[PDB]
Structures are given as C-alpha cells and as structure tokens.
Amino acid sequence: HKPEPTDEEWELIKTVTEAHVATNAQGSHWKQKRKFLPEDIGQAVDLEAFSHFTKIITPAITRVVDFAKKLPMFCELPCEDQIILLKGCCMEIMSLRAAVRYDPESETLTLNGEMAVTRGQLKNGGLGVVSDAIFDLGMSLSSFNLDDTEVALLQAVLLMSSDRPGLACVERIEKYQDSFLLAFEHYINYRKHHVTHFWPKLLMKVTDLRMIGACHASRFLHMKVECPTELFPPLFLEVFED
C-alpha cells in the first residue's frame, strides 16, 4: 500500500514549495523570457563566456540562500552549520534548477530563467566536463517531468546533508532530512506516477547531483589557475573558497 502524506506533512510541503517558488527565477514564464546566448560566444576557458556566467551567478547564489531562509528548520541551525550547508549544496541545487529547465527542442539550459546556453557553451564557460554531467541530467529529468514541489523537496533534501564536513548539529540536520524524505516519498505516492521505479530512480539523481557539485569544486581550483582572481565575483568566491 502507498501511504499518502499526512496533515503535519502537507504543512511542510506547502512551506518548502512556496520556498522554492518565490526563489526560482522567471517563475513559470521562463520559456518566453529566455534569451539565446550568441552562437559565437564560446567556440570550439573562454574569457567572454565565463565573464557572462559570473556576471549573473551572484543572484542565483543569493536566490539559493533565500530558499534556505524560507525554511524554519534551517533557521533553527547555528550560523556555523548554516553557512556550511549552503557552501556545500549550493552548486548542486543551482544545477538541479538549471537541469530541470532543459528544452529538448533547443538542447539548451536556462540559467537564471533568462539565459539559454548549450552543452558546448557551458562547457567552455569553465565547467568543462561538468556541463555534460548537467545537460545529461537535464535530459534524464525530462521524462520525470518534476513539478515545483518535487523539485523543492530535492533541494530541501540536498540542503539537509548530514555528511557535510565541519557540521555540529549532525543528528539534528539528519532528523530534518528524514522528515523531508518521508514527505517526499509520500508526495510522489500521491502524485501516483505511472512510470516504474520512480522513487528510487529519483533518489539516484541525488547521487548524480552530489557528484556535480564535487566535479565543480575541482573545476573551481583549475579556474583560479587559469582565470584571474579579479574575474571572480566576491559572493562566488566565498561560496567555493575552502
């Protein structure tokens, strides 16, 4: 039997959902408000491409943080753990958010809900191989067709990762994650997805994401090896700097 979410859970559901919604760029009118980045930009670490990603990455980062603050549990954490959680899941959530905005017709991703870029563009933009990882994910998420809720829940779970280095209230964070996961699992039961093995398949994505943020971390090291330190926005640095 498939246990649908409880009343105490629906409260958390509407909470997280609203949290994601108010913080996802372009809302539900992203397709029309997106602009294709010039095909010339980033040809086969393109200074130009990079400068454009970094020129719009700081709002994304903040928008991520805003999603966290709209979550009571997260607001119950010490500032120490509060910072660590973000620094970790930051790249992961943004990736998710970008990947769930994949358009098969165009084979492009929508950064900040306004910038469409291709696999190549995002690859030469500093991500390199990560770009593939991300597009591929987006491709995979296409058949899932997740809604704001299901995406919000993933972000939620990603945030509450009780294995980030330097955490204090570990058993506290883990409890939160367990709460989300419970509701997450019940919500999809409610959704009644007709595809076989939806919940597991979805959970594997969490693996994929955690691997993206990781390759991204190694990318950042190489980025400050090639690209100058001035080409990096302050907020960005703080986020992936040790």
């Binding site: 903040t62 943080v65 500032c79 910072i83 973000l86 302050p234 907020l235 703080e238 986020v239």
Partner: peptide, 8 residues
C-alpha cells in the same frame, strides 16, 4: 563568515 552572514 562574510557576505553570507549579511544574507542571513
């Protein structure tokens, strides 16, 4: 520990 704090 910086801009993150003020954003909190």
């Amino acid at each position: 520990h910086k801009i993150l704090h003020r954003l909190l």
